[PDB]
Short mmCIF file of all heavy atoms in Angstrom, two decimals:
data_model
loop_
_atom_site.label_atom_id
_atom_site.label_comp_id
_atom_site.label_asym_id
_atom_site.label_seq_id
_atom_site.Cartn_x
_atom_site.Cartn_y
_atom_site.Cartn_z
N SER A 1 47.73 131.31 110.80
CA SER A 1 48.18 130.56 109.61
C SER A 1 46.98 129.90 108.92
O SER A 1 46.10 129.35 109.58
CB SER A 1 49.23 129.53 110.00
OG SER A 1 48.62 128.40 110.57
N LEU A 2 46.93 130.00 107.59
CA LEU A 2 45.83 129.44 106.80
C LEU A 2 46.23 128.23 105.96
O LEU A 2 45.35 127.53 105.43
CB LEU A 2 45.27 130.50 105.87
CG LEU A 2 44.76 131.78 106.52
CD1 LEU A 2 44.42 132.77 105.42
CD2 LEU A 2 43.55 131.47 107.39
N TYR A 3 47.53 127.98 105.84
CA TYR A 3 48.02 126.93 105.01
C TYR A 3 49.21 126.30 105.64
O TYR A 3 49.93 126.94 106.42
CB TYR A 3 48.42 127.52 103.65
CG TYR A 3 47.33 128.24 102.92
CD1 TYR A 3 47.27 129.61 102.90
CD2 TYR A 3 46.37 127.54 102.21
CE1 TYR A 3 46.27 130.29 102.22
CE2 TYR A 3 45.37 128.20 101.51
CZ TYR A 3 45.33 129.58 101.51
OH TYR A 3 44.33 130.22 100.84
N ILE A 4 49.47 125.06 105.28
CA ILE A 4 50.69 124.39 105.71
C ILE A 4 51.46 124.13 104.43
O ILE A 4 50.94 123.50 103.51
CB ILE A 4 50.42 123.10 106.49
CG1 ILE A 4 49.52 123.39 107.70
CG2 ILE A 4 51.74 122.50 106.98
CD1 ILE A 4 48.92 122.15 108.32
N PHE A 5 52.69 124.63 104.39
CA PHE A 5 53.55 124.45 103.24
C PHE A 5 53.76 122.98 102.91
O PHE A 5 54.09 122.22 103.81
CB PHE A 5 54.91 125.07 103.57
CG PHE A 5 55.90 124.99 102.46
CD1 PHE A 5 55.96 125.98 101.51
CD2 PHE A 5 56.78 123.93 102.39
CE1 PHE A 5 56.88 125.92 100.48
CE2 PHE A 5 57.70 123.84 101.37
CZ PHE A 5 57.76 124.85 100.42
N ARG A 6 53.60 122.60 101.65
CA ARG A 6 53.96 121.24 101.21
C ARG A 6 55.10 121.18 100.21
O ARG A 6 55.86 120.24 100.23
CB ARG A 6 52.77 120.53 100.56
CG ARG A 6 51.51 120.48 101.38
CD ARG A 6 51.69 120.11 102.81
NE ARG A 6 52.20 118.76 102.97
CZ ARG A 6 51.86 117.97 103.98
NH1 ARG A 6 51.01 118.38 104.94
NH2 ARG A 6 52.37 116.73 104.05
N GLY A 7 55.18 122.14 99.30
CA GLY A 7 56.27 122.12 98.34
C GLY A 7 56.24 123.33 97.45
O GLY A 7 55.28 124.11 97.46
N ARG A 8 57.33 123.48 96.70
CA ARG A 8 57.50 124.57 95.76
C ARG A 8 58.35 124.13 94.58
O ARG A 8 59.19 123.25 94.73
CB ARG A 8 58.17 125.78 96.46
CG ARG A 8 59.57 125.48 96.97
CD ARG A 8 60.13 126.61 97.80
NE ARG A 8 60.75 127.66 96.99
CZ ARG A 8 61.00 128.90 97.41
NH1 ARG A 8 60.70 129.28 98.64
NH2 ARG A 8 61.57 129.77 96.58
N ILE A 9 58.15 124.76 93.42
CA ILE A 9 58.92 124.45 92.21
C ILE A 9 59.27 125.76 91.50
O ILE A 9 58.38 126.53 91.12
CB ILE A 9 58.16 123.54 91.19
CG1 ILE A 9 57.53 122.30 91.87
CG2 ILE A 9 59.09 123.06 90.07
CD1 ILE A 9 56.59 121.55 90.95
N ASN A 10 60.56 125.97 91.26
CA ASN A 10 60.95 127.10 90.41
C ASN A 10 60.42 126.81 89.02
O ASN A 10 60.70 125.77 88.46
CB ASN A 10 62.47 127.28 90.47
CG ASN A 10 62.98 128.31 89.45
OD1 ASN A 10 62.26 128.79 88.59
ND2 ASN A 10 64.26 128.56 89.51
N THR A 11 59.62 127.70 88.46
CA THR A 11 58.97 127.39 87.20
C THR A 11 59.95 127.07 86.04
O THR A 11 59.57 126.40 85.08
CB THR A 11 57.95 128.43 86.75
OG1 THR A 11 58.57 129.72 86.67
CG2 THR A 11 56.76 128.49 87.71
N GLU A 12 61.20 127.53 86.17
CA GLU A 12 62.27 127.17 85.21
C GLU A 12 62.61 125.68 85.15
O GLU A 12 63.13 125.21 84.14
CB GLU A 12 63.55 127.91 85.56
CG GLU A 12 63.52 129.37 85.14
CD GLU A 12 64.51 129.65 84.03
OE1 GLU A 12 65.72 129.78 84.34
OE2 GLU A 12 64.08 129.75 82.85
N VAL A 13 62.38 124.97 86.26
CA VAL A 13 62.65 123.53 86.33
C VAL A 13 61.33 122.70 86.35
O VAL A 13 61.34 121.53 86.64
CB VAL A 13 63.56 123.20 87.54
CG1 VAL A 13 64.83 124.03 87.50
CG2 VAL A 13 62.87 123.43 88.88
N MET A 14 60.21 123.33 86.05
CA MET A 14 58.92 122.68 86.11
C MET A 14 58.51 122.26 84.71
O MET A 14 58.30 123.09 83.85
CB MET A 14 57.90 123.66 86.70
CG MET A 14 56.51 123.09 86.95
SD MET A 14 55.38 124.35 87.53
CE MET A 14 55.10 125.34 86.05
N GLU A 15 58.40 120.96 84.47
CA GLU A 15 57.97 120.44 83.17
C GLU A 15 56.51 120.01 83.29
O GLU A 15 56.19 119.16 84.13
CB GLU A 15 58.80 119.23 82.81
CG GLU A 15 60.28 119.50 82.75
CD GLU A 15 60.67 120.35 81.53
OE1 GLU A 15 59.87 120.38 80.57
OE2 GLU A 15 61.76 120.96 81.56
N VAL A 16 55.64 120.58 82.47
CA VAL A 16 54.21 120.31 82.58
C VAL A 16 53.80 119.56 81.31
O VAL A 16 54.15 119.98 80.20
CB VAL A 16 53.42 121.63 82.73
CG1 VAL A 16 51.91 121.38 82.83
CG2 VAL A 16 53.94 122.42 83.92
N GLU A 17 53.07 118.45 81.47
CA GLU A 17 52.49 117.74 80.32
C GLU A 17 51.01 117.45 80.49
O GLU A 17 50.54 117.25 81.59
CB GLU A 17 53.22 116.44 80.10
CG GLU A 17 54.60 116.63 79.54
CD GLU A 17 55.41 115.37 79.66
OE1 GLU A 17 55.55 114.88 80.79
OE2 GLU A 17 55.90 114.88 78.62
N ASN A 18 50.28 117.43 79.37
CA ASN A 18 48.86 117.15 79.40
C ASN A 18 48.67 115.68 79.67
O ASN A 18 49.53 114.87 79.30
CB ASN A 18 48.18 117.54 78.10
CG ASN A 18 46.69 117.33 78.15
OD1 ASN A 18 46.03 117.78 79.09
ND2 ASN A 18 46.16 116.57 77.19
N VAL A 19 47.57 115.34 80.36
CA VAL A 19 47.16 113.94 80.51
C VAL A 19 45.78 113.82 79.89
O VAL A 19 44.90 114.63 80.16
CB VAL A 19 47.11 113.49 81.99
CG1 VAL A 19 46.49 112.10 82.13
CG2 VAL A 19 48.51 113.52 82.57
N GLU A 20 45.56 112.82 79.05
CA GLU A 20 44.24 112.68 78.42
C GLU A 20 43.28 112.01 79.40
O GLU A 20 43.68 111.10 80.16
CB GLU A 20 44.29 111.84 77.16
CG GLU A 20 45.12 112.45 76.05
CD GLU A 20 44.85 111.81 74.69
OE1 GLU A 20 44.52 110.59 74.63
OE2 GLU A 20 44.95 112.55 73.69
N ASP A 21 42.02 112.42 79.34
CA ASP A 21 40.96 111.90 80.21
C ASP A 21 40.90 110.40 80.08
O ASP A 21 41.09 109.88 79.00
CB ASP A 21 39.58 112.50 79.87
CG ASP A 21 39.43 113.95 80.29
OD1 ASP A 21 40.31 114.44 81.03
OD2 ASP A 21 38.45 114.59 79.85
N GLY A 22 40.72 109.72 81.20
CA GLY A 22 40.67 108.28 81.22
C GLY A 22 41.99 107.56 81.40
O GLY A 22 41.98 106.36 81.55
N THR A 23 43.13 108.26 81.36
CA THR A 23 44.46 107.65 81.49
C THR A 23 44.65 107.18 82.92
O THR A 23 44.30 107.90 83.85
CB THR A 23 45.61 108.68 81.23
OG1 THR A 23 45.55 109.16 79.90
CG2 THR A 23 47.00 108.07 81.43
N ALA A 24 45.22 106.00 83.07
CA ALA A 24 45.62 105.44 84.36
C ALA A 24 46.93 104.74 84.13
O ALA A 24 46.99 103.82 83.30
CB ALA A 24 44.58 104.46 84.90
N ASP A 25 47.99 105.21 84.79
CA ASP A 25 49.32 104.64 84.56
C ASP A 25 50.19 104.92 85.77
O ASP A 25 49.72 105.49 86.76
CB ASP A 25 49.92 105.17 83.24
CG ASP A 25 50.16 106.69 83.23
OD1 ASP A 25 50.19 107.34 84.30
OD2 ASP A 25 50.32 107.27 82.13
N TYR A 26 51.46 104.55 85.70
CA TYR A 26 52.31 104.67 86.89
C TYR A 26 52.51 106.13 87.28
O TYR A 26 52.65 106.40 88.46
CB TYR A 26 53.64 103.90 86.74
CG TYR A 26 54.64 104.49 85.79
CD1 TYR A 26 55.45 105.51 86.20
CD2 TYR A 26 54.82 103.98 84.49
CE1 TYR A 26 56.38 106.06 85.35
CE2 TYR A 26 55.75 104.54 83.63
CZ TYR A 26 56.54 105.59 84.09
OH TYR A 26 57.50 106.21 83.32
N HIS A 27 52.50 107.06 86.29
CA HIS A 27 52.59 108.51 86.61
C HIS A 27 51.45 109.02 87.42
O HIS A 27 51.66 109.94 88.24
CB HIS A 27 52.70 109.41 85.38
CG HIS A 27 54.07 109.44 84.79
ND1 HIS A 27 54.37 108.78 83.62
CD2 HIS A 27 55.22 110.03 85.20
CE1 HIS A 27 55.64 108.95 83.33
NE2 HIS A 27 56.17 109.72 84.27
N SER A 28 50.25 108.44 87.23
CA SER A 28 49.11 108.78 88.07
C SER A 28 48.93 107.82 89.27
O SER A 28 47.82 107.76 89.86
CB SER A 28 47.84 108.84 87.22
OG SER A 28 47.52 107.58 86.64
N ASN A 29 49.98 107.09 89.62
CA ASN A 29 49.98 106.15 90.75
C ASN A 29 48.82 105.08 90.63
O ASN A 29 48.26 104.66 91.62
CB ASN A 29 49.95 106.93 92.07
CG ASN A 29 51.23 107.78 92.30
OD1 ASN A 29 51.21 109.01 92.13
ND2 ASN A 29 52.32 107.12 92.64
N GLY A 30 48.49 104.69 89.39
CA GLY A 30 47.37 103.75 89.12
C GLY A 30 45.97 104.34 89.07
O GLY A 30 45.03 103.64 88.70
N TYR A 31 45.80 105.62 89.42
CA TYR A 31 44.49 106.25 89.46
C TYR A 31 44.07 106.78 88.09
O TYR A 31 44.94 107.12 87.24
CB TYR A 31 44.48 107.41 90.44
CG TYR A 31 44.60 106.98 91.90
CD1 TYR A 31 45.78 107.16 92.60
CD2 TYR A 31 43.51 106.38 92.57
CE1 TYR A 31 45.91 106.78 93.91
CE2 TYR A 31 43.63 105.98 93.89
CZ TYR A 31 44.84 106.17 94.55
OH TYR A 31 45.01 105.83 95.86
N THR A 32 42.76 106.92 87.89
CA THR A 32 42.21 107.41 86.62
C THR A 32 42.16 108.90 86.63
O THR A 32 41.62 109.52 87.55
CB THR A 32 40.82 106.78 86.30
OG1 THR A 32 41.03 105.39 86.14
CG2 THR A 32 40.27 107.30 85.01
#
């Protein structure tokens, strides 16, 4: 085994949004 499964997302239910450089907010758990 080379990997340990952590999660999966059916791309039909996957919403992707851009984050601008330098953003730090609750979505990024406080990180930049």
Side-chain angles (χ1 to χ4, degrees):
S1 79
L2 302 173
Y3 302 102
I4 304 166
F5 181 88
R6 307 315 296 214
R8 62 188 276 162
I9 311 170
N10 172 352
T11 56
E12 283 248 282
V13 306
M14 185 184 72
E15 302 288 340
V16 180
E17 288 166 303
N18 183 51
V19 172
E20 296 196 329
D21 287 349
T23 297
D25 63 17
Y26 72 81
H27 281 106
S28 64
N29 295 104
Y31 291 106
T32 297

